[PDB]
């Protein structure tokens, strides 16, 4: 979003990320590794699922016929009744449109916030010997091939596996 654009986050995307919406990439001698973070993707999906349930909870009164107003006899009243129904449908429609707009706004805008959280998951595992660049990337002393990246996504990566220090 606008954060990433100013922060200099990568504006492009990775086709290799298929098992998730968000995750990590790694650049070294192996080339470019790509892994999806299932935890971040699930959180995004759970938020959307809760949002869907929230939108689906809305109840509005049925619009039926007036019981007293008879056809032909009470046509003028029935015209007003038609108008009341029409305006109800109109007003609630725009209100729902607003509620959905704000919902989609939140979801799309939360993308960069997922990345920022993914920064913290990555940072801790990489240990004190890694260097935070700031654009959403970290510079490591060790090699990090596709196999290394997968352990990061799964949250099992240890810094001691490269003789580097960990947060105790």
């Amino acid at each position: 979003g606008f954060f990433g654009a100013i922060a200099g986050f990568l504006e492009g995307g990775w086709e290799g990320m298929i098992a998730g919406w968000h995750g990590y990439t790694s650049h070294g001698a192996h080339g470019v590794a790509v892994a999806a973070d299932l935890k971040s993707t699930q959180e995004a999906i759970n938020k959307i699922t809760k949002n869907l349930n929230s939108l689906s909870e809305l109840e509005v009164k049925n619009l039926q016929r007036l019981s007293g107003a008879m056809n032909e006899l009470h046509d003028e009243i029935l015209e007003l009744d038609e108008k009341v129904d029409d305006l109800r449908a109109d007003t609630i429609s725009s209100q729902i449109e607003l509620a959905v707009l704000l919902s989609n706004e939140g979801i799309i805008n939360s993308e960069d916030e997922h990345l920022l959280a993914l920064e913290r998951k990555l940072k801790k595992m990489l240990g004190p010997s890694a260097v935070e660049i700031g654009n959403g990337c970290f510079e490591t002393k060790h090699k990090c091939n596709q196999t290394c990246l997968d352990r990061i996504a799964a949250g099992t990566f240890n810094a001691g596996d490269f003789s580097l220090p960990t947060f105790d």
Binding site: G13, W21, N62, R65, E72, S94, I108, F138
Partner: protein, 340 residues
């Protein structure tokens, strides 16, 4: 090496609107609407749904039943939901009525608006003490009863002056008492018979136009009868008749009396409708086929899936999708990114 945080990139054909980024493509959406398809109408799930007023009254229209046509008396089941299937209800038997000269057609549509509908068991007016000399009770071949003898609408009494009473009268006034129970609305059915000059003379001893005036809840209705030269018989039994009746109804709120001022040819009210509660009513058609979550005037029977729907808005009852102006979509993915 350099490890970074990244977002996927896939085909993004779906579009949603946002507040701060305009329309954006997305990798996935959850659909919130559908355009329903027209179906047969049906019973509202979890609620007895009224179609015909009297289900066990075979070969009877709702208007037939509402007027108390012989052979058309039965149980009127209570219903919290009713289908208006006749915009202009018709009769299918009994004595020829000139319907469009009053509001009478809407009577069964008026009734179905109530949850509970019952016909009174006692008469509201005693014809043997009713103003306007002594009467005998007339019947017709047009209205054969359950044993096929000559009869008449059970909601009314075709009173005829006795042979020694064939004389004109000034307009006399009868009070229609409230005979219904606590909270019930009373719907009083009444009218007047008219004929050609000859039959008028024979039946009533007067061939001049007769005048009728009703009053209830501040509503007054005035009628003047027609002598001969009637429009053709329609919606009746098919038995040729020289005369025509005009029928009207009169709404009496709880504990309220009404008045009818009348001359010759009067059809005095007998059995009256006692109705209470409110029934939810929408336009629809018969028969009711199956069950549904929601009844919709344009789409008929309809089951709820998506929370919203698009298309033709109309009156709808039950567990329904909420109408929306456009096909809304909830984002279930990420804003489109070109491949790195």
């Amino acid at each position: 090496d350099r490890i970074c945080t990244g977002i996927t990139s896939s085909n993004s054909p779906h579009v949603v609107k946002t507040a701060t980024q305009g329309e954006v493509n997305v990798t996935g959406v959850i659909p919130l609407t559908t355009t329903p398809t027209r179906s047969h109408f049906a019973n509202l799930k979890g609620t007895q749904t009224r179609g015909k007023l009297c289900p066990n009254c075979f070969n009877c229209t709702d208007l037939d039943v509402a007027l108390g046509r012989p052979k058309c008396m039965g149980n009127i089941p209570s219903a919290k939901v009713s289908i208006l299937h006749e915009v202009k209800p018709v009769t299918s038997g009994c004595y020829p009525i000139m319907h469009d000269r009053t509001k009478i057609r809407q009577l069964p549509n008026l009734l179905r608006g109530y949850e509970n509908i019952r016909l009174s068991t006692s008469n509201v007016i005693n014809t043997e003490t009713a103003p306007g000399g002594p009467y005998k009770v007339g019947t017709s071949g047009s209205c054969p009863n359950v044993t096929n003898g000559n009869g008449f609408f059970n909601t009314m009494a075709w009173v005829i002056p006795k042979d020694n009473n064939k004389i004109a009268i000034n307009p006399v006034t009868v009070e229609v008492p409230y005979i219904c129970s606590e909270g019930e609305d009373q719907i009083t059915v009444w009218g007047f018979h008219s004929d050609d000059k000859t039959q008028m003379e024979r039946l009533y001893g007067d061939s001049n136009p007769q005048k009728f005036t009703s009053s209830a809840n501040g509503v007054t209705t005035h009628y003047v009868s027609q002598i001969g030269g009637f429009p053709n018989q329609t919606e009746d039994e098919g038995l040729k008749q020289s005369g025509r009746i005009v029928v009207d109804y009169m709404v009496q709120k709880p504990g309220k009396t009404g008045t009818i001022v009348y001359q010759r040819g009067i059809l005095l009210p007998q059995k009256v409708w006692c109705a209470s509660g409110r029934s939810k009513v929408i336009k629809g058609s018969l028969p009711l086929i199956g069950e549904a979550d929601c009844l919709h005037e344009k789409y008929g029977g309809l089951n709820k899936s998506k929370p919203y729907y698009t298309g033709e808005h109309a009156k709808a009852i039950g567990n329904c999708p909420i109408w929306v102006k456009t096909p809304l979509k909830l984002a279930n993915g990420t804003k489109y990114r070109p491949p790195a």
